[PDB]
């Protein structure tokens, strides 16, 4: 009559990796990083974004002819950008501020168009001027949200404008100067030379003049248009005046809603999906703490890491090898319904079992360690991209030091984390049973014999109960007190 | 005739938790975390705040009618402001690199004011000029620190004014110019058209010229004034020049002391108390390496986290539930002068006492710990906080995510330790204990019995000699063999 | 006849600290910390870098006559500079965008320069005019890189410039603009007044007008100079205009290498030696992942902490003590070849052993948990260096806190992964001993006596041979049962 402890062995192929050993074949595990995506550009929770297309957001916002079908625009949840777009200004120039605006678009969803100053009020001036840099079907043309004023027969008097703000939230508001190529340009256009251009309001004040000189000529034209943007707040006023080379504003931008987003620069295309963090690969659908597939991403996403495989041991060593012995020689792919168990040996059977309160207690254990591992880790909607010009570069060298110091930080802290935590978990397995070992021979003393191998080996002829009884945690020493002393002797 | 080993347990009712576990109770704790503040605004080290109460910065600097208390400010320590100040720039306008200027106030102390060009050398120029926005009983007025310098007569000579700096240490000089509503205003105020101010020292070189526009009215006015700064350094000059709309100062600012300070954003006053580490809520006085009270803190102060609970154990599981029995199936209550001991029952009256060597090992070890988390922790003076302007959102914005990523790293980290460290301490006592009984048992060898509840039976008579001898460490084995070898075979 | 089993002991004098204890002797550890230098400065991946003496950046490329020893520079590795160098602009002036161009040439390794604008080419002007300031022999004279315009005569016709880059990559053109002291100056140098000067590339267009005002004395002169640069692509064209006041460029920087470095701040020359890491006192040549000698670096660096003792427990704890005893009475000197092992005392004689398997099982697991420590660290090339203003104090406080923040975070997780870790290692060894002891007793059984101080006494005669099938693993108890049975019970 036997009875042996001992752990349970399947026919699993994973593997871990432990601070003092490498390749450990487990039989359960976890995996807490992901490495699978979509493959495509889908919603954020459940609105499209915005796709500009061969668009850029001053050609969108400018108006520029070739992107007619951006002029009203839905809801967005985040914008959709090439690397280098085609259809931006078509008119040589610059924008001021350009990184500013684009980071303010990131947080607004939507926008609103408000006629603020009609085309028809210029009535002391010419407002039908356009150029063959940005020309449909062949005649010259001209943005959509701007106008050009010019000269009305052989004079051009002070051009006033203005307007308050009574729309309900505040503005976005653009204007424009243009600077000429030569005298006799600013002389044909806007008669007078000197001239000046000035706006103001209640927290601006702004005058610039025109610069006249020969450059390279980019889209056939020795000219360029200088854009400036500002924003007015509610029940305030904005003034212009112009005494020349002014290109006004037309339209005004009031902000619709607020929130978060941001610009993803792919050259994809929106297909029908959704999901909630979304990547310039594709999208992840997890409840994992931790990814690999790309560092910039839109929404509420895991910790990026540099790491290929970060798996959490959850079961024990699969030693798959086992008269049929004990802990001591492995383990057995018998008993399953159980981590640690008991087999015994007697005359009425013999046959495998599995410890309730032990494999209880481990579970909870374990199930609580992979819990506190993963839901301790702050996650927040996060858009992970910035922009910077050509002459801040230390301000993209510093963003850049930035992200991946913290990138390092976090992947030597998860490695470390997991080595320690696999080396902790398999040594608590063995704790375990070698604490049901000891907990069974103390509670069983001396009427037995010790064979060694892992088991015990009776001396009385212990029927069924009595193996309940050892196995119950109640077991009555004295009833078998004489009858054992008496073989164990002989 | 028996002898127990067990541990110490009370009625305390901490809880702590550790990686496998939940709201396990304990008998000592320590918490390392502080929560609790005095709630007022004290002195940091002696020195008093500066109390700006209704005013900003640039009021105080300019010297606006209103806060005529602050112009003769004493040594400070930190400068206390709201956070929509009342009374700042009476005449309205703006102030150029004001971000930086109060950067630069936050790491000085004192401050000493000294006249540099007194009024009273313009003698070709009218210096009386005033406004209704700055009034005083009704009477316009002006700011204190600066001279208005309008046309005397009918003529406006070219203005020139020099200061060596002499004085011994660094120096704060500001001026201004205006930038008026119409021509006839400019023509009233200064008698010609096409006016420059230039301003010059070693390593500055300004020219301004003003701005004449129609701009909304802000306090009444739709002029406005725009006020720029610079640091003159030791034994160097500075020039001002000027044909119109300058505005000239005649107190330069010298930097008598400095140090580490900065600048709190509070609705609050100063009241007789003092401190070492200061938040916008109150005061800390604690040695703890970490705090949840506010993240803008003033001083040396611990470190920052997200958290609620952060309690280190010190101390035994608390489970009190003792024919006296041992380790094996609870603690004990009799024992009140040690964590580990024994309880013995003679002949000669029974009853509890301590082991001293593993107490006092234990008890340094677990001091020790508790000393290597807390003093190994980094605390140097700083002032969480700075100001950015309305056209650096980008820069606010990584200020915002540097400072959030370190603390989602150190609350991730300390709840981490925290854990791992209670769950070592857990079974550091257990593993302590099982060695006191395994110890006891190598030393008793077969003289004696067990019993599976934690403690021993003799099989002689072993009167306190020889058990004080058992818990001393030196038992004699020969001395008792033969007595005890022959009741043991029957 | 007498088996024992222990560790092993030496003269070693390293110590250790845990979590737990203080100064703990090991007979082996390993220093993961580097604090040794060679005081010298050399090339870093063989190319020596560029000694700039007494010169600066600006000086080095405007053509400082004093700096003519760099007027054709071979390739660099990186760049050394004064901290206060005593020649740069010798007229005295600006130059705009300063750090810029210095972090633009933190990633060069080689310029080429190339003649663009002869001197020649100006026939309608005067191309020899030089200041005193600039002095060679006692002559006035002037930068060599660049061209003084001057009138001809009574004459400053228009000056027009323009060069098409064909050269074969981006290029650097730097020019100049000249504010003089009065009126009466400007006169005698162009002639004309009211002044421009214009730049124009398809991307740039500046223009700029001079300032004539009296300003305080730099090296004897109360004019001054501000220069600016730009970055000209591929087949580009740059036009200069100027009615005066134009320093024009004589030369063009052409990039040419293209890679990673950096400029450090020291007061040295070169000497000849090679490194892959440089800091400002000397050079790093180790395998360790820490190191506490420089903050500032260039190269690929271990990280920095601040740290003074960084080591690591290899070896088992020295407890230099003693038929003979075992495990718990100290540790064995006499055991030369493993640290683990046994003592055997015969008939035939008396030694020690080493028990190869559970050595080399515990040598592999401490030696991959020093390279799971050591080889998960991440070491690119990385320079610290960064150069701000002095209107740019909030960002280089933003930088210093990035710095400061990110050292702390390392030297904590670094302090307290070695406590734990060495806590862990050395429990593992008393862990390693107490299970050979529990092997060698369960395969024993009851054949033998147990000492108490870690031997047993065998109950039987054992010539070498059962004692060599005892230390591997193969002994027969059911041979010796008969044989040991008698001498116990007598
Ligand atoms: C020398 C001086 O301070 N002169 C005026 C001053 C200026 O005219 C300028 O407006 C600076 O603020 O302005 C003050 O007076 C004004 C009114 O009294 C007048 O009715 O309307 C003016 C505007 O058209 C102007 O507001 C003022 O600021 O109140 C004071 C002083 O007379
Ligand atoms: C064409 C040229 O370099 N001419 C002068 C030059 C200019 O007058 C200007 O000052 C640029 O530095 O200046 C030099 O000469 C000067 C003295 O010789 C003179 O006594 O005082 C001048 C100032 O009032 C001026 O300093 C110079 O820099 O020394 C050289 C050259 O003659
Ligand atoms: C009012 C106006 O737009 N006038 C003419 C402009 C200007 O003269 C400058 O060239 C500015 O581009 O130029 C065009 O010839 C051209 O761009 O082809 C179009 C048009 O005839
Ligand atoms: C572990 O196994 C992988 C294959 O899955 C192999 O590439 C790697 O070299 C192995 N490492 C060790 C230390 O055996
Ligand atoms: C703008 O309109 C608001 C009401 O919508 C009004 O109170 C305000 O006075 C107006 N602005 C001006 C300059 O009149
Ligand atoms: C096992 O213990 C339970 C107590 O929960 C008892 O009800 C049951 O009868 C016991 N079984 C045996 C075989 O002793
Ligand atoms: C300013 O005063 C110092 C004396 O402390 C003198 O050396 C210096 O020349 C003076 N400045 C000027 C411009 O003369
Ligand atoms: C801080 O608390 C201690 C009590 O531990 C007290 O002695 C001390 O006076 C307190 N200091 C302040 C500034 O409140
Ligand atoms: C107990 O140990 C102490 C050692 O400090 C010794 O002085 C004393 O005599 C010992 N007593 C007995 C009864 O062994
Ligand atoms: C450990 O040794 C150092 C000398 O190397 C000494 O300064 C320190 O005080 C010692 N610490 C303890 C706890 O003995
Ligand atoms: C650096 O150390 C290595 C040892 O691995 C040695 O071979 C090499 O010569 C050393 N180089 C220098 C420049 O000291
Ligand atoms: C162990 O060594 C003994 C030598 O005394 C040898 O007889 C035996 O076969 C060896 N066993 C194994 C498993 O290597």
Redesign the interface.
């Known amino acids: 009559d036997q009875i042996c402890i001992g752990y349970h062995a399947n026919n699993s192929t994973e593997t871990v990796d432990t601070?003092?050993?490498?390749n450990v074949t487990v039989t359960h595990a976890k995996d807490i990083l992901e490495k699978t995506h979509n493959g495509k550009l889908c919603k954020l929770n459940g609105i499209p974004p915005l796709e500009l297309g061969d668009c850029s957001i001053a050609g969108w916002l400018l108006g520029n002819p070739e992107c007619d079908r951006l002029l009203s625009v839905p809801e967005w949840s985040y914008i959709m950008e090439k690397e280098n777009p085609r259809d931006g200004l078509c008119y040589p120039g610059?924008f001021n501020?350009y990184?500013?605006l684009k980071?303010?678009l990131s947080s607004v969803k939507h926008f609103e168009k408000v006629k603020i100053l009609p085309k028809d009020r210029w009535t002391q001036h010419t407002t039908t001027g356009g150029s063959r840099a940005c020309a449909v079907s062949g005649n010259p043309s001209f943005f959509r949200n701007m106008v050009w004023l010019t000269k009305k027969g052989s004079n051009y008097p002070v051009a006033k404008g203005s307007y308050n703000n009574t729309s309900g939230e505040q503005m976005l508001i653009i204007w424009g100067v243009h600077?000429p190529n030569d005298e006799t340009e600013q002389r044909t256009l806007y008669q007078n030379v000197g001239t000046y251009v000035?706006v103001?309001?209640?927290?601006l004040?702004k005058?610039s003049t025109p610069?006249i000189?020969?450059?390279?000529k980019?889209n056939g034209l020795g000219s360029?248009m200088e854009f400036s943007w500002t924003?007015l707040d509610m029940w305030?006023?904005i003034?212009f005046?112009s005494t020349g080379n002014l290109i006004a504003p037309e339209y005004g931008f009031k902000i619709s809603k607020r929130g978060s987003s941001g610009i993803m620069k792919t050259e994809g295309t929106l297909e029908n999906c959704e999901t909630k963090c979304q990547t310039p690969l594709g999208a992840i659908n997890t409840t994992l703490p931790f990814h690999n597939v790309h560092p910039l991403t839109i929404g509420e996403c895991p910790k990026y890491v540099?790491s290929e495989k970060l798996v959490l041991a959850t079961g024990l060593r699969n030693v798959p090898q086992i008269a049929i012995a004990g802990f001591?020689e492995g383990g057995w792919q018998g008993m399953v319904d159980g981590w640690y168990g008991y087999h015994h040996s007697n005359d009425q059977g013999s046959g495998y079992a599995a410890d309730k309160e032990s494999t209880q207690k481990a579970f909870?254990?374990?199930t609580?360690?992979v819990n506190?591992v993963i839901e301790?880790?702050?996650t927040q909607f996060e858009a992970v991209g910035?922009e910077?010009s050509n002459?801040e570069?230390?301000?993209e060298?510093?963003?850049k030091?930035?992200e991946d110091?913290?990138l390092?930080?976090?992947?030597?802290?998860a490695?470390?984390?997991v080595?320690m935590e696999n080396e902790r978990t398999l040594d608590f397995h063995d704790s375990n049973v070698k604490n049901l070992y000891d907990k069974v021979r103390?509670?069983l003393?001396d009427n037995v014999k010790?064979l060694?191998n892992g088991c015990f080996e009776f001396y009385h002829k212990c029927d069924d109960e009595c193996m309940n009884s050892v196995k119950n945690g109640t077991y009555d020493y004295p009833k078998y007190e004489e009858e054992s002393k008496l073989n164990r002797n002989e």
Not at 19 to 22: A, D, M, N, S, T
Not at 200 to 203: E, I, P, Q, Y
Not at 213 to 216: I, V
Request: hydrophobic share 30%; net charge positive.
């Open positions: 601070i003092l050993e490498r610059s501020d990184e500013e980071h303010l600077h000035s103001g309001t209640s927290t004040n005058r610069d000189a020969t450059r390279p980019v360029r924003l305030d006023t003034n005046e540099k001591i909870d254990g374990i609580n360690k506190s301790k880790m702050n910035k910077f002459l570069r230390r301000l060298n510093l963003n030091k930035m110091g913290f390092d930080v976090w992947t030597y802290n490695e470390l984390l080595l103390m509670q003393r010790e060694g």
